[PDB]
């Protein structure tokens, strides 16, 4: 069971899907969606 839960939702280029993970870097991770270094959760992605 989970304390409280936030689902974050957004769209990105498929190459940039590697940048969402905690500790990664690049043109979206540095500038508009950073996960914390010690994150817990799941990241889920599909082409649309």
């Amino acid at each position: 069971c989970f304390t409280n839960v936030y689902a974050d939702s957004f769209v990105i280029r498929g190459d940039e899907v590697r940048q969402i993970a905690p500790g990664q870097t690049g043109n979206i991770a540095d500038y508009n969606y950073k996960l914390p270094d010690d994150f817990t959760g799941c990241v889920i992605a599909w082409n649309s």
């Binding site: 905690p22 500790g23 870097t25 270094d37």
Partner: protein
């Protein structure tokens, strides 16, 4: 088994996620190196 003997060198070249796997090697090996010294000094202290 770390990439380097020098703590600053490990931090000069690796990111947070990868650096910790090298640093904790030096922490584990140096903490053994102290526990050997302190045990040996307690055994010397018991003779003195």
């Amino acid at each position: 088994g770390a990439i380097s003997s020098v703590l600053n060198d490990i931090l000069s070249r690796l990111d947070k996620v990868e650096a910790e796997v090298q640093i904790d090697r030096l922490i584990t090996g140096r903490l053994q190196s102290l526990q050997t010294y302190v045990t040996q000094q307690l055994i010397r202290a018991a003779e003195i």
